[PDB]
């Protein structure tokens, strides 16, 4: 169940909001963690083809460049059961951590896609930190882009859960983590989304992406 | 824009929600 290639493992990923240094007191929208357990191992790109970019540099081309073991699909059920966004003065962020056996400089590109078309991209570079015999990489508290903050505002205030799911059917994120020096794909993660019911927290299911 | 996304996804329903 690890999002791990031969060269890189994403151990943790969370997106959250909190009061601007009012905390502990955060709310997680989505969360993958070693701290948090979770429970069909592959999905073919044909199932998600139109939900991601597919031109030069697109998902299919990236997959064909490989390596095949670097490509994953994560389905998230996002927990929007919070009122912090309505109070204002909130901080919205994303934190991730990775590990490798190798010392690398990595670049994480995150593309937000609407109906399969990129609308915003964030690029972050991180450096290896040796700890207890392996290399750790952290992207800590990266602020969510304004597009996504506004999207969450508008989404959480629709009148029906099913409408939230409809909006989310054509909202995706494509994360590509590359080795900065070689441009090798270390990890490529396609994210698709639904909302959690009010009585449930965030959930996820992880798949390997394949292409028959 | 976020508004354009919502209008594409929800059709006339979003037009009604946004207006009123």
Author numbering:
A (entry chain A): 210 to 232, 235 to 250, 255 to 427
B (entry chain B): 8 to 27
From the primary publication:
When inspecting the structure of 4 bound to TEAD, we identified a salt bridge between K250 and D235 that connects helices α2 and α3 and thus appears to stabilize the tertiary structure of 4 in its bound form. For the longest crosslink (4E), highest affinities were obtained for both TEAD proteins (Kd = 1.2 and 0.7 µM mTEAD4/hTEAD1) exceeding linear precursor 4 and the full-length VGL4 epitope 1. The overall structure of the complex between 4E (orange) and mTEAD4 (grey) is very similar to the two-helix motif (blue) of VGL4 in its bound form with the structures of mTEAD4 in both complexes superimposing closely (RMSD = 0.949 Å). The electron density for 4E is well defined, clearly revealing the backbone conformation and orientation of the side chains. Notably, we also observed a defined electron density for the crosslink. Also, both peptides exhibit a similar overall conformation (RMSD: 0.56 Å) thereby presenting analogous side chains towards the shallow hydrophobic groove on mTEAD4. The only noticeable difference between VGL4 and 4E is a slightly larger angle between the two helices resulting in a minimal dislocation of the C-terminal part of helix α3 (max Δl = 1.5 Å). Consistent with the crystal structure, we identified interface residues H237, F238, L242, W246, and I249.
One of TEAD’s interaction partners is the co-repressor protein named transcription cofactor vestigial-like protein 4 (VGL4), which binds TEAD at a conserved site and inhibits its translational activity. Here, we report the development of a proteomimetic molecule that stabilizes a two-helix arrangement derived from VGL4 designed to bind TEAD and to inhibit its interaction with VGL4.
